[PDB]
Amino acid sequence: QSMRALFITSPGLSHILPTVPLAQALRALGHEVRYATGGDIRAVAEAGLCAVDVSPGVNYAKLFVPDDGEGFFAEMFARVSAVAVDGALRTARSWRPDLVVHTPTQGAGPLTAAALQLPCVELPLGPADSEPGLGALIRRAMSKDYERHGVTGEPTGSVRLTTTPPSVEALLPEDRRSPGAWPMRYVPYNGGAVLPDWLPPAAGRRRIAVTLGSIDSGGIAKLAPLFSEVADVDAEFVLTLGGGDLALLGELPANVRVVEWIPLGALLETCDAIIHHGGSGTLLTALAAGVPQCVIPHQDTNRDVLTGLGIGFDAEAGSLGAEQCRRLLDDAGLREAALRVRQEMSEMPPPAETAAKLVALA
């Protein structure tokens, strides 16, 4: 009795990655998994899974922002989802899944689910993604697509998963939170790697991970002040580039490492604290690691989550220095709170457990 799960996701890397542990879990149970997506589809392949490119060649940039309230953005997500609908449906009809897994904004997901009269499972990337008015709006904005394929029905089942721990949930606004969602442990995934030599920690040697952000803080230069001080801090700093950005590395202070992309979860497992730019992937991964955090803001959400839980704080790039670093390293309060949420997350069912329930539902 081999079940089949079709994963229909937004084309964005950050939307795909958090679906991977679940997909992986279903396979571990002996079931069949396939993705129907476009865009950053290579990520699926790089996770040891199989994907069908439902929109080959399509330029996504110009779909999100063509050359020319809730309503505008629903229309945007609709345009983007639309180009995936045909391929999603072909694939479903030939592969015949028992279950559609999708991401909040990928409208092709529920469409496909309804069209094959299948239950669907919504997997968000984090506390932000969690907005169920939008799904409805996207469906509305995609009415012609539903019409074109004669989809007039509803998914039989509609399960929502959250990887958001209860205490973080508590701090979200009321309409922005999701009761009746199934809890699932957030298992960080960012890709595999051959791990560098320097990764293993040294004898009683602390370490601070520092992430980055494409554009505006954001950028390697805005980190110039913090650099003027890190020499005075009794810890190693590891600045990780993202995939895709290029760095020209010259002279550095004796305890700053600037480094090619590395899996964050692997990195944070050796770190005492993190300085980052508020990525939803970054926050939850860091929560999982039980590591105090500092956020350089541009996503007020994550700001409040941090201060709210007593897990960290926000700092302006141009003010960031030793003081903040020392606080992250030495403040017992921040530490205790971090470990507390880590504990909380670890009591949530792992993807394996959630996989089993899904098989039961399908």
Added chain:
Amino acid sequence: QSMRALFITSPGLSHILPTVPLAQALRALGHEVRYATGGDIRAVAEAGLCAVDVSPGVNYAKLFVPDDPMHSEGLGEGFFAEMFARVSAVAVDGALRTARSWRPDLVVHTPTQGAGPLTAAALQLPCVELPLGPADSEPGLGALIRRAMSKDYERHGVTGEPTGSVRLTTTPPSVEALLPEDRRSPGAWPMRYVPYNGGAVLPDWLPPAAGRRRIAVTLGSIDALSGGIAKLAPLFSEVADVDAEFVLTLGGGDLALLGELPANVRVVEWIPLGALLETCDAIIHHGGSGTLLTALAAGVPQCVIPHGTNRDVLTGLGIGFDAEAGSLGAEQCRRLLDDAGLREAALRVRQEMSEMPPPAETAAKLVALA
């Protein structure tokens, strides 16, 4: 409160891949997985997992084959044990560094990777042996490798034993039955063989068209270019007369096929076999690492081309047969496609395999053992 599994594997791709579903399963349970290996280590990374290269830069070719014997003694096990020992040795330091800093609770290893049990004993940890298939399954050699690695054990002061020593098999019972007695492994834990060869963006042509039948063809060990492929000319001279599509997988890095092929023959550079066989009605292969088990899992009739042993599994189960390369033609193809007997047997073994505990289930037992 997370358990930790250190996967210490032979450097060969074919040894690494079959350990991936388990590694993946342990992660799905919320636990931690890491590899300490060399060689085809990029495979681990390409599976979404993390690896430490315990032997950077090392040229493995020259380790396997360094740069009368009518009157010589000790030909057999002893020679190959010595070979595997040389190869394992270069991994020992890295394996041990990694274990001591990462601190696993459990060592997973492959039959010939001697650094595995060494590491396990050194940290007084249980170890789990994961073979690539029925051929790999040979205890005794493990013992011989340990013996041949005595200086390495000495150098690191490893004088102990792994506390636990579990063995997993992915070989289904009916296949096991047909192996010689000392070549089979009771007390091994059954685990479902979940095929893995890598992920992929699947090509457009993959979904079967107009219920047109399909036959997968593999190259196995054939090298580029020894002329070996010429061995397939007779089959190709006939495939045009068969009412089926043929899909030839080079199953290799950046390989190219050159020359006129029949129209109903399709060449794919590389594809995940499991994905391929899921759309195939039969397979023609050379008995390569894990082709058989993948084919069994797919429930697809098989034809095997040997070189000039262990093929006995096919006729025994009524699942397929062997054919000499130079005799292979339409007749055999039509048999694979139309013989109801072969089909029924195939589906039967597929069923059998599917009743074996999946990696998820096996993962859980291991957590308990650690």
